[PDB]
Design a binder for this molecule. Sequence first.
Ligand SMILES: OC[C@H]1O[C@@H](O[C@@H]2[C@@H](O)[C@H](O)O[C@H](CO)[C@H]2O)[C@H](O)[C@@H](O)[C@@H]1O
Ligand SMILES: [Zn+2]
Length: 471
Amino acid sequence: WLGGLSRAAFPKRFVFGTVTSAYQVEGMAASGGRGPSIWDAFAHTPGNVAGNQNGDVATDQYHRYKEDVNLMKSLNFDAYRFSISWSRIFPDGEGRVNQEGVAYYNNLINYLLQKGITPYVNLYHYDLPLALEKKYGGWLNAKMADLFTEYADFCFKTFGNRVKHWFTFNQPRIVALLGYDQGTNPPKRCTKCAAGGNSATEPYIVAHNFLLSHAAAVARYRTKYQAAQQGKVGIVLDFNWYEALSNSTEDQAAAQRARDFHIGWYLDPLINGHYPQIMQDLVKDRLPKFTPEQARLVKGSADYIGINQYTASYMKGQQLMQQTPTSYSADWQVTYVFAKNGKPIGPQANSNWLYIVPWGMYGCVNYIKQKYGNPTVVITENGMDQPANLSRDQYLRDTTRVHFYRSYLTQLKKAIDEGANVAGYFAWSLLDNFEWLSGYTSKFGIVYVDFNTLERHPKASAYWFRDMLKH
Ligand SMILES: OC[C@H]1O[C@@H](O[C@@H]2[C@@H](O)[C@H](O)O[C@H](CO)[C@H]2O)[C@H](O)[C@@H](O)[C@@H]1O
Ligand SMILES: [Zn+2]
């Protein structure tokens, strides 16, 4: 049932935790003085989210955080990854501070420390203050570095004496892709989109600014707060594994382009101070250039790399063509493939994009180890969802999720046993929550949340964790 897994099976002092994010669990979207984010607007627009749901109440952790902390402690977790709502601190993203908001995260951090749980804090998780979107054009504007840096500065000043583990951003790739390529996330921009946009150029502008913003914030931390606070700052990048369909040159090349356009996009700048060669070759003048000083500032600017790992795909190649630019996605010139040798790569969870493929966990960790000089990596997210409409009892009986973590974790142990620098592992998610476009129709939590009463009940997987992590 534990499949031989336990704390003894991982390096001494390895960190185990669970994850949530502000908008997804806090609730009190329009109270305690909080200002609206782009997701509030988006979520309140009919047709944007399943069943027209939003995060107004969510799991209402804003009121039940202490219950939740007690829960995670009794599950034997060492750490908790959560995010800070920019607009809860700065209703307008700049200027006036919301004291009540500060009070909240103060109370949360203190209670966590009081109960022996280590805070791992994200500064940003999709929730850009609406006011900044309307006034500056959001991440399309280089001015975001200043704005984000001032925001980071206040956090370091205000919680830095107790928070020692920071993350700046969360999956800037999904922002760029879904927000500016496909236009399915706020600000819903893309070539054909009603809000305007350009899927061939904007995705790259956005990513560049994320990187610059990250570097600026880390520069500020390192020059102003690090000495006294002795903290760390990393960044969270999603990485789904890409496997060559066959052993042909063509297919091997494809899988690697996919890797480079997926994770290299951000890792090459962060580790090597430049975008991947292939991207420079293919995207050309649509890819912004880093000035030498910007590159020098970007390179080395992450104390650890958070990887959000979920799934894996087969990749098929093809002769590279000279093409009219249309989209960041089309720039890869690769073909996604379903099965190999007539077998599917793995079964699917509730989410159509989530294929259960344990060995992809190993692919990713190992690849970053081999290709990037083995930097310190943290698995910042890993888990799967159940569908909506099951009975309470069916949720609590998540045998599939139990098998998911046992397998994935076994694969993580294999990569680690082979010398990979993984410092920690975080399960997404602690609670069933607001799953963006899917609203409340997708359940990722190891703890069940009844969205009528908001009661918590731990699932089998919660108990599986409690067993596996006992001291
Ligand atoms: O999917 C649940 C949580 O996952 C995280 O982003 C996901 C990516 O890791 C994955 O590659 O793609 C899916 C769908 O495109 C993303 O949701 C986020 O950190 C969480 O906010 C999200 O709920
Ligand atoms: Zn409440």
